[PDB]
Amino acid sequence: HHWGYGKHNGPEHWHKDFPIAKGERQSPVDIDTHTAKYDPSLKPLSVSYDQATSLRILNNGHAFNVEFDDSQDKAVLKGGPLDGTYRLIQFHFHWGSLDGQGSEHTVDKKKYAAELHLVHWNTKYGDFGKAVQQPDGLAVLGIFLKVGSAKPGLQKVVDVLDSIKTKGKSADFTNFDPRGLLPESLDYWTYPGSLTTPPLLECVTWIVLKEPISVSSEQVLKFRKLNFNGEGEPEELMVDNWRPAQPLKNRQIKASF
């Protein structure tokens, strides 16, 4: 009986195996834009993905991860609320069964069709394993997806999904440039949070971009063709793999603009 997004193993059940699920800095959260405050102490955000080198794409039974070689300081996130350098290790998405839901973070309670998470670990800790034992070990850049015009930079990802339909399947995925998934503006909201899936570790500095990227209905429809199940098992479409907004508790969301 492993965790998932169903009625008997979904978000409302996670706290039993992962008590931190009811912690003091859980993610995602609703971003109340009127309550968020501009923070002048924030330095310019730096997203340097020019030397990013992807290696593989994997269906882990919850979502699919595009993995990067993080053995060297190449694709890095710096500036903004961050102290030091954070290295990109992988990115994935959360999406819904319908266009009106799918994102984890919400803006004034509005849910987007999906949400992209670019995961980075603080290099001062040597490896991501050690990083997830630190309150500032991770930085996740979140980007909302709305349905409209297609995102050319996303097509390569969409076209390989047929090769990793079921849980456990992986496929070579080299030379993918994540720069093609970034909106024009880097305006963002930031707050201290957690991983949004078990283990739900509270080691993440969240940086959520205000400007969503547009993807086509056809592109997201292909996301919805993936399976939560492994090969040879009854088909359970990989949809609504998002955790709902959690209590803000003693936290303040800061705006870069």
Tokens of 179: 């720069």
DSSP H or E stretch at residue 128: helix 128-131
94 has binding-site annotation: yes
Distance CA 88, CA 170 (A): 19
SS3 162: helix
Report the partner that residue 76 touches, choosing among Zn ion, ligand COX, none (CB closer than 5 to 8 A by kind). none
Report the partner that residue 89 touches, choosing among ligand COX, Zn ion, none (CB closer than 5 to 8 A by kind). ligand COX
From the list 96, 74, 99, 93, the residue with the least C-alpha distance to 85 is 74
Distance CA 100, CA 105 (A): 13
Tokens of 128: 């991501």
* Residue of 21, 66, 88, 140 interacting with ligand COX (CB under 6 A): 140
- If you compute the radius of gyration of the chain from its CA atoms, what whole number of angstroms results? 17
34 in catalytic set: no
Q: How many residues bind ligand COX (CB under 6 A)?
A: 11
Q: Which of residues 193-222 bind ligand COX (CB under 6 A)?
A: 195-197
Tokens of 150: 């297609």
* Residue of 82, 132, 209, 215 interacting with ligand COX (CB under 6 A): 132
What is the smallest separation between the CB atom of 117 and Zn ion, expressed in angstroms? 4
Is residue 137 within 8 Å of residue 108, measured between CB atoms?
no
105 has binding-site annotation: no
Report the partner that residue 49 touches, choosing among ligand COX, Zn ion, none (CB closer than 5 to 8 A by kind). none
SS3 94: strand
With tokens 């990109």, the residue in question is: 88
* Residue of 117, 120, 167, 254 interacting with Zn ion (CB under 5 A): 117
From the list 114, 135, 116, 115, the residue with the least C-alpha distance to 125 is 135
62 binds Zn ion (CB under 5 A): no
128 binds ligand COX (CB under 6 A): yes
45 binds ligand COX (CB under 6 A): no
Q: Which of these is catalytic: 1, 2, 15, 62? A: 62
Contact residues for Zn ion, defined by CB under 5 A:
117
Contact residues for ligand COX, defined by CB under 6 A:
89, 117, 119, 121, 128, 132, 138, 140, 195-197
Q: Which residues are annotated as a binding site for Zn(2+)?
A: 92, 94, 117
Q: Which residues are annotated as a binding site?
A: 92, 94, 117, 196-197
